[PDB]
Design a protein around this ligand. Structure first.
Ligand code: 90P
Ligand code: 90P
Ligand code: SAM
Ligand code: SAM
Ligand code: CL
Ligand code: CL
Ligand code: CL
Ligand code: ZN
Ligand code: ZN
Ligand code: ZN
Ligand code: ZN
Ligand code: ZN
Ligand code: ZN
Ligand code: ZN
Ligand code: ZN
Lengths: 257, 259
């Protein structure tokens, strides 16, 4: 196992994300630019008018059902450790509205998780037969925020003319996409699994422009130290790529083999 | 001395900014919203195209002569402690271009100070005759980043119809010019009083974008500021051209230019 980078994020995350290769001679991938938060090339005109934000007037730590931001989320789904409650619907997640800079509450209130960024110890590594992948170095309890799907925000019309579509996440009115091909974070290396240990959740933080949810992966179960991360890429991906290759996730319940 | 808030920023800064009143019974100011970063109401159309960033290719910590970002700034003006070099021209500051997310360097490189946020221990306090002011609770060495002038980014045409103009900071022409209004949304800097021999100087800084219409305004210390001293900057001639007919400067400098 060769260490090919001590940190693919170059210090932009809380902790480093090293890259190792125990399989072959490929060096650390360098065909893209690591960015820790979303970017644009062509302008997106995201609504950032501060007076358009809904916000709460809580005098506590936003643990009561009176919190407007919890109400927008149906309820606040976070426990005091920032983990999703047992009742959270992993099969059909709601939208999460975290507290923002317009709220009366403090920056340490209960309804702030994704806005605090990536915390888990992750590693980019060479898989046996699925190129690069991402693993957790430590145990991750169920319902824990793992990482955001970060990249270049683009229009559907722009996605329609992109040659490489293997690093797209659809935000689907007007519809948009996150393309992690040229600019992306660690999430661009996460492989597909049919019984995934991550689920994507649509989250609003500093803006509430519903065209532009941010995509937060939360653990669907206990992820043991060493395990590869995976999420369900969905049907659009497989309708297209199923023509070219079959799923190698190896699940007994694999739906694309 | 009554402590009226342990932190006006509600935990949004690296350190608390308490408010005290040892003069009268005025409560902690509450007729504005504290924001730690600039905001907009009407859209500003800031150029955030990542391919429009100029960036560096440094293989080190950006302390060499060769850093592109330093070159844009004339040279990198920051020493190893994040303080402006002695040669920095306080009377005529250059534009500073800090490193950014398009640069090849690491997040801990030398050319990153303002983007790391407010670090000095500050306090909002009631002054005897100039309302609220801000003081340092610690010694601040010369050339230290103290705080950013944060508020609502507005056009000159919007500034033209803003009745309350006592919390405005004018930005740079280009035939297009903007302002930061800290009246409704602002950080601690909205409370800093004017001084004719100021211990702070505003420096125009670029970080995540390089849209020259929207420099960010970073106050740096012009000298050693002693623990307890009130912070001050020079509001400039436009402020005093307008407000001079309503009141005179009470900074108390023996060289006061607006008394
Ligand atoms: C030419 N070339 C044809 C294929 C097309 N691929 C994909 N498009 C979109 N689009 C256009 C979206 C735009 C938003 C609204 C829905 C359609 N999305 C793709 C998403 C993919 O994976 C999730 C995915 O995988 C492989 C492929 C996706 C990209 C352009
Ligand atoms: C009506 N009423 C007229 C005066 C106007 N005041 C000010 N305008 C600007 N403007 C228009 C700028 C806009 C950017 C381009 C240059 C002119 N600036 C003001 C700045 C002030 O203090 C620095 C200041 O203090 C007291 C006052 C400022 C507010 C509207
Ligand atoms: C977003 S990338 C993931 C990172 C990729 N392995 C790499 O090396 O860059 C998606 C691509 O990885 C491969 N891949 C991901 N999951 C897979 C799976 N379950 N079975 C087969 N190939 C997969 C496919 O080539 C797919 O188009
Ligand atoms: C940006 S505010 C500063 C905070 C203000 N003291 C407060 O209590 O909100 C500007 C106002 O403070 C007062 N002020 C600031 N510096 C002053 C000075 N040197 N002399 C007289 N008044 C001053 C004036 O009323 C001025 O319009
Ligand atoms: Cl958190
Ligand atoms: Cl954002
Ligand atoms: Cl910015
Ligand atoms: Zn609340
Ligand atoms: Zn809250
Ligand atoms: Zn809230
Ligand atoms: Zn499968
Ligand atoms: Zn450099
Ligand atoms: Zn740089
Ligand atoms: Zn640098
Ligand atoms: Zn004076």
């Amino acid at each position: 196992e060769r260490i090919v980078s001590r940190d693919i994020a170059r210090g932009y995350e809380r902790i480093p994300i090293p890259c190792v290769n125990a399989v072959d001679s490929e060096p650390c991938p360098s065909n893209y630019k690591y960015v820790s938060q979303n970017c644009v090339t062509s302008p997106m005109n995201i609504d950032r008018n501060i007076t358009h934000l809904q916000y709460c007037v809580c005098i506590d730590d936003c643990s009561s059902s009176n919190c407007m931001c919890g109400q927008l989320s149906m309820r606040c789904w976070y426990d005091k450790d920032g983990r999703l409650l047992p009742e959270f619907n992993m099969a059909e997640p709601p939208l999460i509205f975290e507290c923002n800079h317009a709220c009366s509450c403090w920056r340490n209130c209960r309804n702030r998780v994704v806005q605090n960024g990536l915390r888990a110890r992750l590693q980019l590594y060479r898989t046996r037969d699925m190129g690069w992948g991402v693993r957790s170095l430590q145990d991750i309890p169920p319902g824990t925020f793992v990482c955001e799907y970060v990249g270049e925000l683009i229009s559907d019309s722009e996605a329609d003319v992109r040659e490489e579509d293997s690093y797209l996440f659809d935000l689907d009115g007007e519809v948009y996409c996150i393309d992690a091909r040229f600019y992306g974070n660690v999430s661009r290396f996460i492989n597909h699994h049919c019984e995934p240990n991550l689920v994507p959740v649509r989250v609003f933080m500093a803006h509430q422009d519903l065209r532009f949810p941010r995509i937060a992966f939360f653990s669907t179960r206990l992820i043991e130290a060493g395990e590869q991360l995976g999420f369900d890429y969905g049907e659009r991906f497989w309708d297209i790529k199923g023509k070219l290759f079959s799923c190698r996730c190896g699940s007994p319940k694999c739906r694309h083999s």
